[PDB]
Chains A and B, each alone.
Chain A
Amino acid sequence: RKVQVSYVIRDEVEKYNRNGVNALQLDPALNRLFTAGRDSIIRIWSVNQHKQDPYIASMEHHTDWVNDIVLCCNGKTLISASSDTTVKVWNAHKGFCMSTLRTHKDYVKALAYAKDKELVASAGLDRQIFLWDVNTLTALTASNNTVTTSSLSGNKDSIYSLAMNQLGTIIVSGSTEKVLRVWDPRTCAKLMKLKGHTDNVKALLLNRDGTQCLSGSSDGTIRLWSLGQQRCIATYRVHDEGVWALQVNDAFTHVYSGGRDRKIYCTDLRNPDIRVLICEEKAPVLKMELDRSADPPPAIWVATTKSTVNKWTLKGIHNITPLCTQPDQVIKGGASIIQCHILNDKRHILTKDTNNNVAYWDVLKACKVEDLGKVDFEDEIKKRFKMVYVPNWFSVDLKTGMLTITLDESDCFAAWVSAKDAGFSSPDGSDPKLNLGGLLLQALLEYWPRTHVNVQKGNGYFQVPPHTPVIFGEAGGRTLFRLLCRDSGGETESMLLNETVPQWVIDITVDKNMPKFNKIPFYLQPHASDRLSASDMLQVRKVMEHVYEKIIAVLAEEKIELLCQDQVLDPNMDLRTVKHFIWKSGGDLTLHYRQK
């Protein structure tokens, strides 16, 4: 395929989540809470009510939404599943990625864990379910890199949820087929299929010996299943909208439910009418993880689409109104950037975030310029207007909640501008022509030794911040290699770059080759009072002097006025912008010339 380069404009440390949180895991031996951020970063928090700043560290390697996490091997290892189609294995104590599994071919949606076999399995939207012995994965090294798989078949559609029991003898999958499909993980033989539910199932739980199952569904019902009888023995319709998250106590007798309608209930399975409104959250509840230090659980952690994470206290079960009104602890979140406008100079960007704060950024220097506060966004757009046209040369996406800039071979080199119109002075008194994408490419790879020529480091006009992440991926999906700008001098990074950097980047960054120019054909005719062509950056003045000569500086400008579509042209305006902003007809641009 075709390889794109991208990078994220951001600060070196994002202590707080910049987006919602998809999943949670609680380590009881160290009092550490893991959050799987939709902003692609996993963060570790301390739940000691002592410390005022619970943040400990970020583990950044993922490129997209982190959909599930499972703490394995008595808390040493966490495994995560992401929408970039990979599963990664991390050392949870030191916070670095050890291995990346790439056998999946689409978004990985759900992870499962069987403590008694120390077995995990992964499943996603690609309809595959792979089973992995965690100790085989941890035994992996750079020489012994071979891993072998075992997978289950039968699944006809995209998987959205998945649960295993503690003994690791039953595995159940949930999908848009609405039926939950069950296998024996020990033999991979397909077992019975229990049909009855009528919608997607995003939440699944099994009792310890895989004899009962709870399913939570977007149809709003909770259903309890006996696997020994293969039938539903109770159905609970306690929500108004889809149920997205389920938890259960150790005794398997009270179910905690939450979902799109923001309300969280505790319902007794033996006697439904005894039910407790636990709280109403501020945003749809996505996942919950009980602290299980003591039998009647003391608290429940709640993840939503918002960046804040609330701990709610549980006074007890014995006793319309919510039991609790304010969270007991609060881990603060940050704002997401939700709206973006590229200005006409094709160099600066205006943003709006979820807090209605407005900021101004410098794409070329990869940094923020000024906070503009809560001014009106569209009035700020209209106030910062300049009549200039520059061809599109990048694209922006907000999927991670940060500004991500993408460069593609098709248009990366399309934008030549003059040094004078840029913020780059003319220390020798003249301003030659710079290609923006080529300068950016040279700045991103400034620390790559192969671009250094016999000493120059970079391009001589600007640096990017050293911590900017630079990502090389294939268009449509598979990330190939990700590093930080400052790390390029390493021997491992340089080897992988040499193996991964596409020839179309090498052309600019290594050989120092100029990209192709672009010319504009145009007409000149006496309707103001011959078919020519020139550079798209040529100033009207140059055409005026041309005309002055062919029909014989200061005098030329004084005497000849140039016109287009009967509008008087600004002599400093270039042909490109005129064509974009004034030519409203079809076929080639037509200019009329006159003598005054």
Chain B
Amino acid sequence: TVQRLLKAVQPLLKVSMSMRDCLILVLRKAMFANQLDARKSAVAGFLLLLKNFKVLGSLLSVSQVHVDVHSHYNSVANETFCLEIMDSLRRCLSQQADVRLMLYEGFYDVLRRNSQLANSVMQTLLSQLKQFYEPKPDLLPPLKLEACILTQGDKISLQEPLDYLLCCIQHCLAWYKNTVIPAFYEDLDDILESITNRMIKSELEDFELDKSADFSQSTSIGIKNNICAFLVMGVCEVLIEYNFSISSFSKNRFEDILSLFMCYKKLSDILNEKATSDSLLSMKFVSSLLTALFRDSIQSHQESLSVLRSSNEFMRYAVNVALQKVQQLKETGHVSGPDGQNPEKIFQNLCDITRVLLWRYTSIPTSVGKSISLLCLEGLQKIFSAVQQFYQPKIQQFLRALDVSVTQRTAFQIRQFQRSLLNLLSSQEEDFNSKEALLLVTVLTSLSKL
């Protein structure tokens, strides 16, 4: 409720000066208060207060009166103010897992919107990560498995969400290297590369999770061993995302990412059948994976991309992640990863996701677990309803972005689905696939509403 209230009231914060100083004073007093769960809200206030305003801060007894002093503001003083208010957050990283979660999630926007603090946020992240990453020539489990777990009172919980940390430093390094350049950022990517090249070579027995050892949901070692699998799961996802973009297009990185997905999928198979969480792929990366995997056909990429295209399970994984993002948008108006609260970026990305899923279904119904085509059609079914529910004034722009007024475009789409429905209904029964016809009828309803 404090996060939602502050987000709602921040337009008044944007244009004022007395209000911002009052909030700063309240949050500063709340930080030093020894009562816990007060810091849990103080940091949540500070992230919003800092990731939206470039300059903040100013320019009692009865016997004292405030007076106006006409000193024009000193930029270096304000920069030192920001640096101190961020150093407080730097030493706030010895708390429970939720504060670490929201700090890791807010640092990317803090770096993006206040460019001056660039060379200190990364000296926070890089100096925190090295508590776990273990640099040597060869020690096969390169990330420390147990260093982020706690054992007090036999109520085992995790403190350091290592996956979220590594994701945050990944996005921070991407924004640093790609955009705002015109040797710490030269060392950090080498650290990341030495994480990949010794994580794909993990036997998965060097995490001591080789066989289905305990994995229970009730015992002592079981819950900890379960929690110590989601960390490596998220690390594998984020490392896939980075190793896509470390180099433009070469087969070596693609052998790396495919083998690392194999090491993800083996663990997911082991963990799933015995007894989940969301994925860590950024939304724009999901779109740039789908579009670059199905649609584009430039001959230079083809040699390397044939390796990633031949993994049938990888296709299902990618479309499942896209479907998960669409589902999260359907439930609430924010996707998980970055740009989650910015609606226009989600709309622009969703346009491309629709444009590529439509091509995948329509272009190749050759002979049609579940097949890929049904997953694509289910994604269309979810995403049209999402568009109609949330992006109401932009339906015309959405229909303009696919490849005259809205009604002719919608008639064309309904004809496209119409012909396929007729084609798969014309077959004699013999267990005809009724799921596709049923959800096609659902899509036709949701589209004929237009």
Are B17's CB and A499's CB within 8 A?
A: yes
Residues 116-144 of A contacting B (Cβ, < 8 Å): 140-143
Task: Compute how far the CA of A102 lies from the CA of B70 in the bound complex, rounded to whole angstroms.
Answer: 13
Are B69's CB and A141's CB within 8 A?
A: yes
Are B59's CB and A492's CB within 8 A?
A: yes
Whose C-beta in chain A lies nearest to the C-beta of B66?
Answer: A145
CB distance from A89 to the nearest CB of B (A): 9
Are A145's CB and B63's CB within 8 A?
A: no
Whose C-beta in chain A lies nearest to the C-beta of B59?
Answer: A142
Nearest first, the 8 A-B pairs at minimum CB distance are A148-B64, A142-B71, A100-B68, A498-B15, A492-B72, A148-B63, A499-B17, A142-B59
CB distance from B76 to the nearest CB of A (A): 13
Residues 53-78 of B contacting A (Cβ, < 8 Å): 55, 58-61, 63-73
Listed A/B pairs (18) with beta-carbon separation below 8 Å: A98-B70, A99-B67, A99-B69, A102-B68, A103-B65, A140-B67, A141-B69, A142-B59, A142-B69, A147-B64, A147-B66, A147-B67, A148-B61, A148-B65, A490-B72, A492-B59, A498-B16, A499-B18
Are A146's CB and B64's CB within 8 A?
A: yes
A343 contacts chain B at the CB level, 8 A cutoff: no
Q: State which of A101, A103, A142, A148 has its C-beta within 8 Å of the C-beta of B58.
A: A142
Q: State which of B17, B63, B69 has its C-beta within 8 Å of the C-beta of A495.
A: B17
A505 contacts chain B at the CB level, 8 A cutoff: no
Known contacts A99-B68, A102-B68, A146-B64; is-contact A492 B16 (Cβ 8 Å): no
Task: Compute how far the CA of A138 lies from the CA of B446 in the bound complex, rounded to whole angstroms.
Answer: 73
A456 contacts chain B at the CB level, 8 A cutoff: no
Residues 339-359 of A contacting B (Cβ, < 8 Å): none
Are A149's CB and B68's CB within 8 A?
A: no
Whose C-beta in chain B lies nearest to the C-beta of A96?
Answer: B70
Are A146's CB and B68's CB within 8 A?
A: no
Residues of the B chain whose Cβ atoms lie less than 8 Å from the Cβ of A490: 72
Task: Compute how far the CA of A97 lies from the CA of B68 in the bound complex, rounded to whole angstroms.
Answer: 11
CB distance from A108 to the nearest CB of B (A): 15
Task: Compute how far the CA of A499 lies from the CA of B64 in the bound complex, rounded to whole angstroms.
Answer: 24
Residues 122-179 of A contacting B (Cβ, < 8 Å): 140-143, 145-149
Are A491's CB and B55's CB within 8 A?
A: yes
Task: Compute how far the CA of A102 lies from the CA of B66 in the bound complex, rounded to whole angstroms.
Answer: 9
Whose C-beta in chain B lies nearest to the C-beta of A151?
Answer: B63
CB distance from A511 to the nearest CB of B (A): 13
Task: Compute how far the CA of A123 lies from the CA of B63 in the bound complex, rounded to whole angstroms.
Answer: 18
CB distance from B327 to the nearest CB of A (A): 36
Are B63's CB and A101's CB within 8 A?
A: no
CB distance from A191 to the nearest CB of B (A): 23
Whose C-beta in chain B lies nearest to the C-beta of A493?
Answer: B72
Residues of the A chain whose Cβ atoms lie less than 8 Å from the Cβ of B59: 142, 492, 495
Select the residue from B55, B65, B69 with max chain A CB neighbours within 10 A. Answer: B69
Task: Compute how far the CA of A60 lies from the CA of B326 in the bound complex, rounded to whole angstroms.
Answer: 63
Question: Interface 1/0s, chain A 464-501, versus B by CB < 8 A?
Answer: 00000000000000000000000000111001101100
Task: Compute how far the CA of A499 lies from the CA of B15 in the bound complex, rounded to whole angstroms.
Answer: 7
Residues of the A chain whose Cβ atoms lie less than 8 Å from the Cβ of B71: 98, 141-142
Are B67's CB and A102's CB within 8 A?
A: yes
CB distance from A587 to the nearest CB of B (A): 48
With A145-B69, A146-B60 given, name 16 new contacts (CB 8 A): A98-B70, A99-B70, A102-B67, A103-B65, A140-B69, A141-B69, A142-B59, A146-B66, A147-B66, A148-B61, A148-B64, A149-B65, A495-B17, A496-B17, A499-B16, A499-B17
Are B69's CB and A98's CB within 8 A?
A: yes
CB distance from B72 to the nearest CB of A (A): 5
Residues of the A chain whose Cβ atoms lie less than 8 Å from the Cβ of B63: 148-149
Question: Interface 1/0s, chain B 10-33, versus A by CB < 8 A?
Answer: 000001111000000000000000
Task: Compute how far the CA of A499 lies from the CA of B13 in the bound complex, rounded to whole angstroms.
Answer: 11
CB distance from A62 to the nearest CB of B (A): 13
Are B70's CB and A491's CB within 8 A?
A: no
Task: Compute how far the CA of A103 lies from the CA of B64 in the bound complex, rounded to whole angstroms.
Answer: 10
Question: Interface 1/0s, chain B 279-306, versus A by CB < 8 A?
Answer: 0000000000000000000000000000
Residues of the A chain whose Cβ atoms lie less than 8 Å from the Cβ of B68: 99-100, 102
CB distance from A411 to the nearest CB of B (A): 27
Task: Compute how far the CA of A147 lies from the CA of B18 in the bound complex, rounded to whole angstroms.
Answer: 19
Residues of the A chain whose Cβ atoms lie less than 8 Å from the Cβ of B60: 146
Task: Compute how far the CA of A201 lies from the CA of B150 in the bound complex, rounded to whole angstroms.
Answer: 83
Residues of the B chain whose Cβ atoms lie less than 8 Å from the Cβ of A99: 67-70
Q: State which of B16, B58, B61, B73 has its C-beta within 8 Å of the C-beta of A491.
A: B73
Select the residue from B16, B59, B67, B70 with max chain A CB neighbours within 10 A. Answer: B67
CB distance from B221 to the nearest CB of A (A): 55
CB distance from B19 to the nearest CB of A (A): 9
Are A100's CB and B67's CB within 8 A?
A: yes
Whose C-beta in chain B lies nearest to the C-beta of A88?
Answer: B70
Residues of the A chain whose Cβ atoms lie less than 8 Å from the Cβ of B67: 99-102, 140, 145, 147
Residues of the A chain whose Cβ atoms lie less than 8 Å from the Cβ of B69: 98-99, 140-142, 145
Task: Compute how far the CA of A143 lies from the CA of B55 in the bound complex, rounded to whole angstroms.
Answer: 16
Whose C-beta in chain A lies nearest to the C-beta of B62?
Answer: A148
CB distance from A518 to the nearest CB of B (A): 32
Whose C-beta in chain A lies nearest to the C-beta of B72?
Answer: A492
CB distance from B53 to the nearest CB of A (A): 11
Select the residue from A97, A99, A102, A145 with max chain B CB neighbours within 10 A. Answer: A145
Task: Compute how far the CA of A427 lies from the CA of B386 in the bound complex, rounded to whole angstroms.
Answer: 50
Residues 36-93 of B contacting A (Cβ, < 8 Å): 55, 58-61, 63-73
CB distance from B57 to the nearest CB of A (A): 10
Residues of the B chain whose Cβ atoms lie less than 8 Å from the Cβ of A98: 69-71
Task: Compute how far the CA of A143 lies from the CA of B25 in the bound complex, rounded to whole angstroms.
Answer: 13
Residues of the B chain whose Cβ atoms lie less than 8 Å from the Cβ of A102: 67-68
Residues of the B chain whose Cβ atoms lie less than 8 Å from the Cβ of A492: 59, 72-73
CB distance from B115 to the nearest CB of A (A): 17
Residues of the B chain whose Cβ atoms lie less than 8 Å from the Cβ of A141: 69, 71
Task: Compute how far the CA of A101 lies from the CA of B65 in the bound complex, rounded to whole angstroms.
Answer: 9
Task: Compute how far the CA of A557 lies from the CA of B315 in the bound complex, rounded to whole angstroms.
Answer: 81
Residues of the A chain whose Cβ atoms lie less than 8 Å from the Cβ of B70: 96-100
Select the residue from B58, B59, B68, B72 with max chain A CB neighbours within 10 A. Answer: B68
Select the residue from A140, A142, A143, A498 with max chain B CB neighbours within 10 A. Answer: A142
Task: Compute how far the CA of A149 lies from the CA of B55 in the bound complex, rounded to whole angstroms.
Answer: 33
CB distance from B388 to the nearest CB of A (A): 31
Residues of the B chain whose Cβ atoms lie less than 8 Å from the Cβ of A96: 70
Residues of the B chain whose Cβ atoms lie less than 8 Å from the Cβ of A101: 67
Task: Compute how far the CA of A96 lies from the CA of B72 in the bound complex, rounded to whole angstroms.
Answer: 12
Residues of the A chain whose Cβ atoms lie less than 8 Å from the Cβ of B73: 142, 491-492
Task: Compute how far the CA of A58 lies from the CA of B18 in the bound complex, rounded to whole angstroms.
Answer: 32
Residues of the B chain whose Cβ atoms lie less than 8 Å from the Cβ of A146: 60, 64, 66
Residues of the A chain whose Cβ atoms lie less than 8 Å from the Cβ of B66: 145-147
Whose C-beta in chain A lies nearest to the C-beta of B54?
Answer: A491
CB distance from A69 to the nearest CB of B (A): 18
Task: Compute how far the CA of A145 lies from the CA of B67 in the bound complex, rounded to whole angstroms.
Answer: 6
Task: Compute how far the CA of A499 lies from the CA of B73 in the bound complex, rounded to whole angstroms.
Answer: 16
Residues of the B chain whose Cβ atoms lie less than 8 Å from the Cβ of A97: 70
Whose C-beta in chain B lies nearest to the C-beta of A150?
Answer: B63
CB distance from B382 to the nearest CB of A (A): 36
Are B16's CB and A147's CB within 8 A?
A: no
Residues 249-273 of B contacting A (Cβ, < 8 Å): none
Residues of the B chain whose Cβ atoms lie less than 8 Å from the Cβ of A142: 58-59, 69, 71, 73
Known contacts A99-B70, A490-B72, A492-B72; is-contact A147 B65 (Cβ 8 Å): yes
Task: Compute how far the CA of A469 lies from the CA of B65 in the bound complex, rounded to whole angstroms.
Answer: 29
Task: Compute how far the CA of A145 lies from the CA of B71 in the bound complex, rounded to whole angstroms.
Answer: 11
Residues of the A chain whose Cβ atoms lie less than 8 Å from the Cβ of B17: 495-496, 498-499
Whose C-beta in chain B lies nearest to the C-beta of A86?
Answer: B68
Whose C-beta in chain B lies nearest to the C-beta of A142?
Answer: B71
Task: Compute how far the CA of A490 lies from the CA of B60 in the bound complex, rounded to whole angstroms.
Answer: 31
CB distance from A131 to the nearest CB of B (A): 12
Whose C-beta in chain A lies nearest to the C-beta of B68?
Answer: A100
CB distance from A205 to the nearest CB of B (A): 30
Residues of the B chain whose Cβ atoms lie less than 8 Å from the Cβ of A147: 64-67
CB distance from A368 to the nearest CB of B (A): 31
CB distance from B329 to the nearest CB of A (A): 29
